[PDB]
TrEMBL record, chains A, B, C:
<dbReference type="InterPro" id="IPR023346">
    <property type="entry name" value="Lysozyme-like_dom_sf"/>
</dbReference>
<feature type="domain" description="Glycoside hydrolase family 19 catalytic">
    <location>
        <begin position="131"/>
        <end position="191"/>
    </location>
</feature>
<dbReference type="GO" id="GO:0004568">
    <property type="term" value="F:chitinase activity"/>
</dbReference>
<dbReference type="GO" id="GO:0006032">
    <property type="term" value="P:chitin catabolic process"/>
</dbReference>
<protein>
    <submittedName>
        <fullName>Endolysin</fullName>
    </submittedName>
</protein>
<dbReference type="GO" id="GO:0016787">
    <property type="term" value="F:hydrolase activity"/>
</dbReference>
<dbReference type="GO" id="GO:0016998">
    <property type="term" value="P:cell wall macromolecule catabolic process"/>
</dbReference>
<dbReference type="InterPro" id="IPR052354">
    <property type="entry name" value="Cell_Wall_Dynamics_Protein"/>
</dbReference>
<dbReference type="InterPro" id="IPR000726">
    <property type="entry name" value="Glyco_hydro_19_cat"/>
</dbReference>
<dbReference type="Pfam" id="PF00182">
    <property type="entry name" value="Glyco_hydro_19"/>
</dbReference>
């Protein structure tokens, strides 16, 4: 039978390699090289090890971050572009016209963007201070928003995100917060359940088609 | 001597890792992944940072929750099982005969259990409502019982447990309430003192041997 | 034209050869044969593929490891040799005299080397246990020191370096940890930028001239 064997070349260190990650996430080598250490360190720190859990994590994070390219929202909105916030009752039509980008403006200045954020997130998610709306705007692979959540996420990572919220726009912390979210919010209790996991992450079913495509592709590589 | 100045690779984020936790708690990887975020987030929120304190917290919670597997009591009592409650004048013989589980019954339907609980905890520990006995039954890693205690615990976590007592049966809140209990009740004032911390948590020395074994194991791993 | 369609002789397996590695690193045939597998395996695992990135990795690691010859610091210090640590406030004159190597001693006994390390790194970089100073002393091509850093590195490699820190003194892990460090800390985000990369690796500009010489040499060979 020419068997005589059964042993590991090296003790531990058996994790997803960059090739598997690249193919599973569907990104180019440049992005894969950039994110590989952060995603694996984060998955390892929180025990996201089962192939299907890893596949779902990579797929959901891939969807939320626009394919691992965006880590924060911006407020470069036109007056009409603020209609969504108006419909949600986050800003008034009057305010939208005063702050929104005008037809004759190239890009909305920071002081204007900041003003919009401070208004839209005013007295929401624990923001109870001047500048909180903008300072705690959405950041991360999986978007974290508002003082209350930067605080809870910070306690979950042992990082003072209340004092340094901008850390979530840095790769290592963006990856760790996403893994903490995925784990803490119970996504590993619904392995293989795309709809339930998406509900937990998105609080809805937005982008389910893309999430499915990403999960299917990751699962084929890892599982 | 080939000595280079020392420094941290990353800013903050220096907390117990999943492996240390799994090892110190003595549970399998599945339970470790489930509880890791909740236990660490809870310990970080209340400053349970010293190795010996973390070891004691993990061991005590480990003992109280049956190895991190039980978060609430049930009232699936047979007639004989209600012996203790009757002797303690918590319920009368007839009530126990009528509600208790009979020989022809596999288990007690919720309706029966609720009745027993509403009877046993009637007008005790602040309960002053028809279904308070059952609604405020014991929940959490470290068991919390009665309106008065869900109320105090709620003020401690800034969570309305009086309105939503069931939250203590959820991992995140079960973990936070345990950390709040451990800190508020003064367990960190007696680091390493197994007997005193046990008296504080149990109101006696019940299960002291199991607690000692768990603490020794966690201590060997963490301290 | 005597053309002919290209095509690879073999499918994949296209990596830096030992000759290229030897010339790029500037080490003897013996050391090259020793490190070749570990350096290439690590570079492949973390996607260090661009010639300029490979050249910088090899140069920086070459500098930190004293030409690929040292993988750990030692605490074989004489009483007066501990003057540096006293100046840095890591040990007292009394302790240096008690522990330091004496004139009649050929080398410092291990029990005292441990004592010095336990003092020097006490309460630093996450060390909060009795023998953490010595157990997490500097190891690796790029020196890793302290519980905090062995923990993060361990999560980055999926190796329990908290339980087995000595693994970093072994070639394979020393290589992977360096590759992980290089990638995770963002060195590939500053390809060709000697000063930026050096700042990330050293936290300063010590040995910049030598790093420059090694980089030019490696780049000349690989780029």
């Amino acid at each position: 039978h020419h068997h005589s064997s059964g042993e590991n070349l090296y003790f531990q260190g058996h994790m997803m390699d960059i090739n598997q990650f690249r193919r599973a996430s569907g990104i180019n080598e440049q992005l894969a090289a950039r994110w590989f250490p952060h995603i694996t360190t984060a998955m390892n720190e929180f025990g996201i090890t089962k192939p299907d859990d890893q596949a779902m994590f990579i797929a959901q994070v891939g969807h939320e971050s626009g394919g691992f390219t965006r880590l924060q929202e911006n407020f470069n909105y036109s007056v009409n572009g603020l209609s969504g916030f108006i419909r949600a009752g986050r800003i008034t039509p009057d305010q939208a016209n005063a702050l929104g980008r005008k037809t004759y403006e190239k890009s909305l200045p920071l002081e204007r963007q900041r003003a919009i954020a401070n208004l839209v997130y005013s007295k929401r998610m624990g923001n109870n201070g001047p500048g909180d709306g903008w300072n705690y705007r959405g950041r991360g692979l999986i978007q974290i928003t508002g003082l209350n959540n930067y605080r809870d996420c910070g306690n979950g990572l042992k990082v003072d995100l209340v004092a340094q919220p901008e850390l979530l726009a840095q790769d290592e912390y963006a990856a760790r917060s996403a893994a903490w979210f995925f784990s803490s919010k119970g996504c590993m209790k619904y392995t293989g359940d795309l709809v339930r996991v998406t509900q937990i992450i998105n609080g809805g079913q937005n982008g389910i088609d893309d999430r499915r495509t990403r999960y299917a592709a990751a699962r084929k590589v890892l599982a």
